[PDB]
Design an enzyme around this catalytic site. Structure first.
Site, PDB file in Angstrom:
ATOM      1  CB  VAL A  84       3.815 -32.945  13.134  1.00  0.00           C
ATOM      2  CG1 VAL A  84       2.911 -33.425  14.266  1.00  0.00           C
ATOM      3  CG2 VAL A  84       4.423 -34.179  12.469  1.00  0.00           C
ATOM      4  CB  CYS A  85       5.392 -28.063  10.707  1.00  0.00           C
ATOM      5  SG  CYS A  85       4.797 -27.528   9.077  1.00  0.00           S
ATOM      6  CG  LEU A  86       8.917 -32.308  13.146  1.00  0.00           C
ATOM      7  CD1 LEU A  86       9.014 -33.608  13.940  1.00  0.00           C
ATOM      8  CD2 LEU A  86      10.014 -31.375  13.657  1.00  0.00           C
TER       9      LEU A  86
ATOM     10  CG  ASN B 273       6.855 -26.703  14.717  1.00  0.00           C
ATOM     11  OD1 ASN B 273       6.764 -25.667  14.074  1.00  0.00           O
ATOM     12  ND2 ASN B 273       8.024 -27.076  15.174  1.00  0.00           N
TER      13      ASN B 273
ATOM     14  CB  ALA C 289       5.553 -27.920   7.467  1.00  0.00           C
TER      15      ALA C 289
END
Ligand SMILES: O=P(O)(O)O[C@H]1[C@H](OP(=O)(O)O)[C@@H](OP(=O)(O)O)[C@H](OP(=O)(O)O)[C@@H](OP(=O)(O)O)[C@H]1OP(=O)(O)O
Ligand SMILES: *P(=O)(O)OC[C@H]1O[C@@H](n2cnc3c(N)ncnc32)[C@H](O)[C@@H]1O
Lengths: 76, 987, 291, 76
Positions: free
Chosen positions: C143-145, C136, D76
């Site tokens: 960041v991937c959230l 992530n 994402a």
């Protein structure tokens, strides 16, 4: 108690509401099918914009009446 | 040529653009309305337009026409001829011709068949009926349009024959939905994906593609029946295979056929359009009154005289006679008849402008069939102006022998006198600004020598494409300040206008010149901006000065108008706007599914590769003078920010053209070959999830590596643009002949392609560059570019389109052409002259409502969408009541004050607030710079500091404004908001 | 007992402020420290936002006391003395993770429209965009959230101004991203949980992560501490020197156990050599650390 | 032994537990206090998400401590 809303670009929606239901919940029940935030939408009925907190009895909204949704623009 | 119709093509389309050409339209009557409709139509760009008038110019017409002058009035020229020169100046591509053939009952109508649409102005009703009967009997029928304006009243009529066909009901692009489930039932059921409701209506049509299992449905069309927000009904599906996965549906548009009536038939029951639901019955009464006025004018061969009571009684009797004759037998509004009689011979400019805009849009609908036309009547009016006037004297409406006689008959001399003394402030000089200026000139605003002044500011210079919508400028005005050109053009129309023009741009930094006294000196503020942040800033600024504010916005066939008045209404910031959404980052980087994803990816890659890296390189090498110094510092272990990236770029610096070609080849290979291989390696196709669903399921689409090939025009254009950009960025010159396919092919014949699979290396490469004399000062320079959309030779658009198409083909998605990608990348706002003119008319109309100090009820806000078409009028938001505690309440217009002194301290301020307003605060911040918070350490001693020292203001400011809060009555709650407080350093 | 002393000492350095930006007579903003969004701060000169001030004022009371604090993991925060829209946040790797006793600094900015929009978050200790420490995570620190991303998704997975709070955003990070098996934070590979191939991939990922974090999480920080967190870093590592050395030796012993493998032998040997090289210097860096 | 809790909506719930309380129990226990589904019942104490089988004193948690709630991950 059946009620209809017609926004711009020809879109017409069918809603179910009750007179003592207040305006914030009124605008809330459209998000479940359109996704627009309640604060992001403006609702008009017979030339008087619906202020928050009131109910349908305040605006004398009856069955099969038509309300509209509008948005501001930015281009120039 | 797209350089003139970039915006218009987005609104209309290519096929509608072609139908726009090879068009002939006839016009009759060049009054003010005829003048402005002809202007708008010329701005549209029709191949051939014919105008006609048999009358002659008169001095009274000077107040209704902005192209006439004293010389034409002296020479008594035919109005058709005195203007034919000026109209041609707008568009050389438009052929314009004038005519003066007398019109009567016995005139032959055969010649009229040359054109395809006719619009009549200031014409007798029976002859209009005859013309409509003749035109509607034609094969093919010829579109007919009628419109007129009298006093504060207007009438619109239309007829497109018995049957008409429209190729697009709305113009809104069809949406795309993805299939979650399909049930083999009779009738079949299709389930929408989780969330993302289909948002459809029963009876619509759609098509499918790329379906697993139920492959027979691919390429077919169904009619839907919505069941739930995330499901609906389709035709029987029991006869097909089970639904495996996949499936993409898109709405299919369908042409619609409409119908009309003859004018006379519509005269017994006009099908008006409701624009205000407070009085839906009013348009019928307005139509009846207009008919009665026409009957009176026919009978007496004259218009009623202002104040002539016997004429009023006769007209009322006529209206009573006609009203009962009507099919529906409506009531009679005596006030309507009285007011119409009072100002029958008047003429109003902004209403004419708005009517002309909507009529021009209807003409476009007639010639193209692009949108749904109006059927079949329309009435606009502004009676609210005279509603608050009570019972005026007819003497004030008598003409005096100036250009403002018509407006004086409309509203009265005193109101006009108040208009000539107005100091108005305008922000932005866009398309709306020019129309504003024209309306003000026609209204004689600020013409008084004593007082009345206009201020306009815009830093923009004139652009070629802007001339399509902006008329006040000319092609030979390119690269000139907008403000001065507009001011000169306005002054040519009317010499008495006093205009102040600036090249300034409104922003917080320039607040010094636009100080509060400047706002107070001004009387009202008008906005024509294209971004919302400027709207918020100007609204916050004017809130400090308590001045009326007006705002409008437009996009395509849609617009909105807002009015703001102190102490009565709410602010712009009182409501939010829909912020622009952004696709999840991971989708853009790895699994795009829409063309716009690839477009944005290419744009971002371009920005990163050509702006960020050169800027960082230049900053790094201006930080350190000597590269040998940098190497020594690295060898001693000193940390350097961004060192590895810049050293990698420096080690890979090309020297000649062939090196640039090789670099472009390598970058292409990495971008469009290796990434797919790596993604496949990390993620095989057949991998599943815990539920067993395949990882490569919709919306995600598996990509595919694609091999280089010079023969591809996409490949060739991409490589050419990339090489040009690299050569420019590295400041290495080149020749155009090098871009020949043969030369590039010769260059690439000897370049290898690598296959697919630290500080020491960096130090080695840096030292090698040092010993190779590659660290000169010229080498420590790097070209930095800026994105340009209007430049047709820099190749930015070409490169971005090639890259977007390449990446689309990577994931096997349909590419896009140059212009769609250009619009998407540039965020170009489509616009047209009709909507701008109409909203300008509305703003000018409400301007006098503001001027007259009218009660709150008179003002109206308008929202419209000419595509439907639809118009709505509402009453503006009332200011809301906000209470805090002990019954103390305030509104958005409140602002409290404190008078201090040289030794004034924070405790003094707190106690003074507690005493004066009865309650003691808990927090103070100057804008965003915090001044005291009890929570933060060491703030207790801040109570014993001089406010002059603690604030550190500017000497020019004798006061300051601060933000305040109070403790909530019950703990665990937010501090109750309060009005800002203006502290004064002294008396 | 030592954990008690650590908690007591670190409690006093829990929250504080610092002087990061100064102004001349012209109002120009001079950044005394490195920041990620200096351009955005300078461009956003409008002070029209006011509800953000009230929201931050309400938040700061909770932030002064409600911050997590334990020997396993803790968070630290600094703010500007005058402005409150800027914030530097330091996070340490929790226990029983490949991030044991790590140090990670993040730049956080609050937009003008806050709390209508979630605040900006970025990682600055990325080793010069060289290392991807988490599926992530990214080399640039993004960041991937979906909770921060304002996209379609779910109403519950959006930044709701009425309910969502930045402290809860911080709380989300630790046991959701900073986990003992970050390789299993990547979707699709948890499907292969229990298979030896997934085990080997996770082991290789863990060795890569461990050498990366011993490089860029302790040595870099002790050599070049950020001025806002210099004293915090030095007082932390000084009281933890022996434990950190012991656990580092434990990792060194653990990694070499797979050097005999063939599928991942080369990567394991590379990681072991790198880790030993880092530990060699780290030893003397610890020995020279004053109190 | 009750223990304080701070949830997303901020309300500080503090309910009696036992030293031997296993998280399987609390999964169902705290369900209806806010309707939060067990999968969305993602918690941390000591900054660490817990495990169902273990008890409270397994982590040696003290009486009347305070832990916090978090929701499901999505990338994402
Ligand atoms: O600078 P960015 O726009 O972020 O693009 C980078 C960059 O590629 P370019 O130099 O072609 O722009 C990296 O290459 P270096 O500059 O570090 O040499 C490359 O790294 P690889 O060579 O390892 O592919 C990386 O790709 P990735 O993130 O897959 O490692 C890629 O990122 P994007 O193509 O996603 O922008
Ligand atoms: P469209 O671009 O036709 O109209 C907008 C015009 O307004 C100008 N403009 C935008 N923003 C500002 C500011 N801050 N100050 C002054 N003028 C502004 C554009 O340049 C267009 O001319």
């Amino acid at each position: 108690m059946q009620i209809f809303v017609k926004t711009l670009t020809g879109k017409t929606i069918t809603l179910e509401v009750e007179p003592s239901d207040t305006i914030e919940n009124v605008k809330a029940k459209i998000q479940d099918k359109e996704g627009i935030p309640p604060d992001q939408q403006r609702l008009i009925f017979a030339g008087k914009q619906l202020e928050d907190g009131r109910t349908l009895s305040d605006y004398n909204i009856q069955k099969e009446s038509t309300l509209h949704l509008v948005l501001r623009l930015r281009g120039a | 040529d797209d350089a003139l119709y970039s915006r218009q093509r987005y609104v209309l389309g290519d096929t509608a653009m072609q139908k726009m050409a090879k068009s002939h339209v006839f016009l009759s009557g060049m009054g003010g309305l005829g003048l402005e409709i002809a202007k708008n139509l010329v701005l549209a760009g029709i191949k051939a337009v014919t105008i006609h008038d048999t009358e002659k110019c008169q001095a009274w017409d000077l107040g209704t026409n902005f192209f006439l002058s004293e010389d034409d009035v002296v020479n008594k020229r035919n109005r058709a001829e005195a203007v034919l020169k000026h109209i041609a100046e707008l568009n050389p591509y438009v052929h314009v011709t004038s005519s003066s053939v007398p019109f009567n009952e016995t005139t032959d109508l055969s010649f009229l068949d040359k054109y395809q649409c006719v619009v009549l102005t200031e014409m007798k009703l029976p002859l209009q009926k005859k013309i409509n009967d003749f035109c509607r009997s034609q094969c093919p029928p010829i579109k007919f349009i009628s419109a007129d304006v009298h006093g504060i009243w207007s009438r619109l009529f239309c007829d497109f024959g018995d049957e008409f066909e429209v190729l697009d009901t709305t113009g809104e692009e069809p949406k795309e939905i993805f299939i979650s489930n399909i049930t083999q039932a009779n009738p079949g059921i299709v389930t929408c994906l989780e969330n993302h409701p289909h948002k459809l209506e029963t009876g619509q049509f759609l098509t499918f593609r790329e379906i697993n299992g139920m492959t027979g449905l691919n390429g077919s069309i169904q009619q839907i029946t919505v069941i739930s927000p995330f499901s609906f009904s389709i035709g029987d599906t029991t006869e097909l295979e089970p639904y495996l996965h996949g499936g993409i549906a898109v709405q299919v548009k369908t042409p619609k056929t409409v119908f009309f009536e003859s004018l006379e038939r519509q005269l017994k029951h006009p099908k008006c359009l409701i624009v205000d639901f407070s009085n839906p019955e009013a348009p019928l009464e307005i139509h009846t009154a207009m008919l009665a006025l026409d009957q009176f004018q026919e009978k007496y061969s004259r218009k009623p005289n202002v104040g002539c009571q016997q004429d009023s009684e006769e007209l009322l009797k006529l209206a009573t006679s006609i009203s009962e004759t009507l099919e529906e037998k409506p009531d009679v509004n005596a006030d309507i008849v009285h007011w119409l009689s009072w100002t029958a011979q008047g003429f109003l400019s902004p209403l004419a402008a708005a009517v002309g805009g909507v009529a021009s849009q209807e003409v476009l609908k007639a010639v193209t069939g692009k949108f749904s036309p109006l059927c079949q009547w329309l009435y606009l009016e502004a009676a609210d102006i005279v509603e608050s006037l009570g019972k005026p004297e007819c003497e004030e409406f008598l003409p005096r022998g100036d250009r403002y006689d018509a407006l004086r008959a409309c509203i009265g001399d005193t109101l006009c006198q108040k208009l000539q003394n107005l100091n108005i402030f305008l922000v932005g000089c866009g398309a709306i600004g020019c129309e504003m200026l024209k309306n003000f000139a026609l209204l004689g605003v600020g013409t008084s020598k004593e007082k009345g002044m206009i201020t306009v500011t815009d830093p923009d210079l004139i652009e070629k494409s802007n001339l399509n919508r902006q008329f006040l400028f000319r092609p030979h005005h390119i690269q000139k300040p907008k403000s001065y050109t507009a001011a000169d053009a306005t002054l040519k129309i009317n010499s008495q206008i006093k205009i102040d023009a600036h090249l300034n741009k409104v922003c917080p930094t320039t607040e010094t010149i636009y100080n509060d006294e400047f706002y107070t000196k001004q009387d009202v503020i008008i906005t024509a901006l294209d971004n919302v942040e400027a709207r918020r800033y100007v609204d916050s600024r004017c809130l400090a000065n308590l001045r009326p504010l007006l705002d409008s916005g437009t996009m395509g066939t849609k617009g909105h108008t807002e009015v703001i008045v102190p102490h009565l209404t709410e602010s712009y910031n009182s409501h939010r706007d829909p912020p622009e959404e952004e696709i999840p980052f991971s989708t853009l980087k790895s699994f795009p599914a829409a063309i716009e994803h690839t477009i944005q990816w290419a744009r971002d890659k371009f920005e990163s590769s050509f702006s960020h890296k050169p800027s960082l390189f230049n900053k790094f090498w201006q930080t350190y003078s000597s590269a040998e110094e940098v190497l020594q510092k690295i060898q001693s272990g000193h940390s350097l920010e961004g060192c590895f990236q810049v050293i990698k770029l420096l080690s890979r610096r090309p020297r000649n053209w062939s090196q640039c070609v090789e670099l472009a080849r390598l970058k292409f290979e990495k971008y469009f070959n290796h990434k797919a291989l790596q993604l496949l390696h990390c993620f095989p196709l057949d991998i599943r999830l815990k539920d067993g669903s395949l990882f490569w399921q919709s919306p995600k689409r598996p990509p595919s590596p694609i091999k280089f090939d010079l023969n591809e025009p996409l490949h060739l254009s991409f490589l050419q643009n990339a090489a040009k950009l690299y050569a420019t960025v590295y400041c290495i010159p080149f020749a155009e002949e090098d871009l020949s396919a043969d030369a590039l092919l010769n260059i690439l014949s000897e370049v290898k392609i690598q296959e697919f699979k630290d500080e020491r290396n960096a130090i080695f490469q840096l030292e090698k560059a040092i010993l190779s004399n590659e660290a000169t000062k010229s080498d420590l320079q790097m070209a930095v570019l800026s994105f340009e959309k209007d430049d047709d030779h820099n190749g930015h658009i070409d490169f971005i389109t090639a890259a977007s198409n390449l990446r689309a083909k990577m994931y096997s998605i349909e590419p896009a052409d140059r212009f769609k990608t250009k619009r998407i990348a540039g965020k170009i706002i489509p616009a047209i002259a009709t909507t701008t003119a109409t909203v300008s008319g509305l703003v000018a109309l409400e301007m006098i409502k503001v001027t007259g100090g009218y009660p709150f009820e008179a003002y109206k806000n308008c929202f419209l969408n000419l595509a439907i078409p639809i118009v709505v009028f509402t009453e503006t938001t009332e200011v809301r009541k906000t209470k805090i505690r002990n019954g103390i309440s305030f509104t958005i217009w409140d602002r409290w004050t404190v008078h201090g002194k040289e030794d004034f301290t924070l405790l003094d301020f707190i106690n003074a607030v507690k005493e004066k307003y009865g309650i003691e605060p808990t927090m103070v911040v100057q804008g965003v710079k915090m001044l005291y918070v009890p929570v933060m350490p060491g703030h207790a001693k801040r109570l014993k500091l001089t406010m002059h020292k603690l604030v550190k203001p500017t000497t020019e400011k004798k006061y300051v404004d601060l933000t305040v809060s109070f403790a909530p009555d019950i703990d665990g709650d937010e501090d109750l908001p309060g009005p800002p407080v203006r502290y004064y350093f002294s008396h | 007992s030592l954990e008690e002393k650590y908690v007591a000492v670190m409690k006093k350095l829990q929250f504080d402020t610092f002087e990061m930006v100064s102004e001349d007579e012209d109002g120009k903003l001079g950044f005394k420290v490195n920041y990620h969004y200096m351009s955005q701060v300078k461009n956003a000169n409008d002070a029209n936002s006011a509800a953000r001030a009230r929201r931050l004022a309400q938040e700061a009371v909770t932030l002064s006391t409600s911050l997590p604090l334990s020997s396993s993991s803790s968070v630290f925060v600094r703010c500007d003395e005058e402005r409150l829209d800027i914030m530097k946040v330091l996070i340490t790797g929790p226990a029983d993770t490949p991030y044991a006793n790590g140090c990670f600094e993040f730049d956080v900015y609050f937009p003008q429209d806050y709390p209508s929009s979630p605040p900006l978050v970025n990682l600055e200790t990325t080793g010069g965009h060289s290392v991807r420490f988490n599926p992530n995570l990214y080399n640039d620190g993004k960041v991937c959230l979906s909770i921060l991303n304002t996209w379609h998704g779910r109403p519950e997975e959006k930044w709701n101004p009425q309910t969502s709070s930045f402290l809860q955003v911080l709380v989300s990070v630790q046991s959701l991203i900073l986990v003992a098996e970050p390789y299993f934070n990547e979707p699709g590979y948890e499907r292969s949980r229990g298979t030896p191939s997934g085990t080997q991939s996770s082991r290789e990922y863990d060795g890569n992560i461990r050498q990366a974090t011993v490089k860029w999480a302790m040595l870099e920080q002790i050599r070049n501490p950020s001025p806002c967190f210099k004293e915090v870093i030095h007082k932390h590592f000084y009281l933890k020197r022996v434990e950190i050395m012991a656990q580092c030796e434990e990792w060194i012993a653990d990694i070499q156990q797979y050097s005999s493998d063939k599928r991942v032998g080369r990567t394991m040997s590379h990681h072991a050599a790198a880790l030993k090289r880092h530990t060699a210097q780290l030893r003397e860096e610890l020995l020279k650390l004053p109190c």
